[PDB]
Curated annotation (Swiss-Prot):
Name listed for the protein in its UniProt record: Glutaredoxin-2, mitochondrial
Miscellaneous: The absence of GLRX2 dramatically sensitizes cells to cell death induced by doxorubicin/adriamycin and phenylarsine oxide.
Full protein segment contained here: 48 to 164 of 164
Positions with a binding annotation for glutathione: 34, 69, 81
Species: Homo sapiens (Human)
Tissue: Widely expressed. Expressed in brain, heart, skeletal muscle, colon, thymus, spleen, kidney, liver, small intestine, placenta and lung. Not expressed in peripheral blood leukocytes.
A single GO BP: response to temperature stimulus
Consequence of changing residue 28 to S: Abolishes absorption at 320 nm and 420 nm suggesting the loss of 2Fe-2S-binding
Keyword Transit peptide: yes
Leader sequence residues: none
Amino acid sequence: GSSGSSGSLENLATAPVNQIQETISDNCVVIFSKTSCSYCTMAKKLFHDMNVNYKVVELDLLEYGNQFQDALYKMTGERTVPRIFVNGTFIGGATDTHRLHKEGKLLPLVHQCYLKKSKRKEFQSGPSSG
């Protein structure tokens, strides 16, 4: 916690939020959690047991954690952890994600990120200069 000399941050067009959007877009499953909660392990245990290659990231340890921490809070609307992101959509948290698998509302997506990738007759948005 820090008080005073607050209410002013450098201006830039490279917010930490955009950096994440790309991560979830490329990757298949990203779990943004910290090392201050217990549920943090639940998520890992859930996927780990499912044998579904997952990608967790500890913000607490990350120097710029307080940053990527907020950006997410806006994409989810809450500040709870861990945080599971599938297909650029906050399907829910540790508990929620756990329930889905049961109702089979999580697998249907897990088999999508990778699906529809193999080279095929399809136009995709890509950068180009010369």
